[PDB]
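Hi team,

Filling in the usual template for the complex we talked about on Friday. All components are listed, including any nucleic acid strands or ligand strings, so the model treats them as one assembly.

SUBMITTER: L.P.
PURPOSE: interface mapping
COMPONENTS: three
RESIDUES: 360
SEQUENCES:
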Amino acid sequence: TIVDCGPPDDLPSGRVEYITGPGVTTYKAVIQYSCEETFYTMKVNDGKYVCDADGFWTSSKGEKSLPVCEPVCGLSARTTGGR
Amino acid sequence: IYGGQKAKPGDFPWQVLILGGTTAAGALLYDNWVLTAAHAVYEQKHDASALDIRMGTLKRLSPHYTQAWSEAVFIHEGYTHDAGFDNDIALIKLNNKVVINSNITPICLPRKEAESFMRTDDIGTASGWGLTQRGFLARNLMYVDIPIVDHQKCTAAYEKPPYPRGSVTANMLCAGLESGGKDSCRGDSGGALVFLDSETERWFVGGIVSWGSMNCGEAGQYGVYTKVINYIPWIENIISDF
Amino acid sequence: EVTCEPGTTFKDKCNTCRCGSDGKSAVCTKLWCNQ
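RESULT (copied from the run log):
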């Protein structure tokens, strides 16, 4: 009866939440992707995706691809500043 | 490493062991690439076996490591195996992304103004499992803090007879003390010489362990490292073109 | 601990070296040759 984008795929090193309602995958529904905190940052977009008229989950910039969770580089346990 | 001390967990989470016919090293970038020396991965082009890349451990002979494998190896086109040490840099594409943890985390690439943290006498850190003054490979990951040497001092040292002249280029940096002692040695090849960006409090790679005197830690020579900031477009174009 | 031809690039087992002007020294790469 209406356009259905289906359950969205998972985000490696991340997570996905249904915003419009639980398991709601149909036209104009909204999901939110996020990356694991601290150790990763999300790169391409803000992770809000909408079930588009064309039947694809689509980012706020019109991308069909997942966000990418990029590891934060250069973290070390070494003490610095002479401590 | 000569003149160093044991790494603690999480100190050098980029450090990887590359084990084959040789013992050598690299540094993790992102989650699916390893930066190393060209000389360290040259001989393996025609091998059946992928590179055996080991992450996440301090012990060289740890049975407990995170296994990775090469998928592709990119040696800089300007590397000439039979004619000197220029352009000693290579990128390895891993077959899968590694999951990051406290013991496995990539090193940052040098930013545009990284040279501000790599001035003459600024301290960099070499890490590795290479030759120590016990006379064996290190059982434990070692590190040493060493200063960047003035490029013309380094060039002059490697012009003093009997060293072979014309070995040190603009694509190299030198680190160590004039007196010798502290150094990177056989087995340390490919490791990252790292520096702290004190504005971000994040570590970046300034050098790759490359070459030096046959006798490590000798007075009158310095470890020589590939100068990574000169390769940023090459690195970027490889990790894009992929 | 080495004998070689002045100026040339040569292999010392698994390492690459450039020979010194005395033929009794070299500068080399930093691989550990397991053999």
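MY TAKE: Residues 1 and 184 of chain B are 5 Å apart (CA to CA). The first helix of chain B runs from residue 151 to 157.

Thanks, L.
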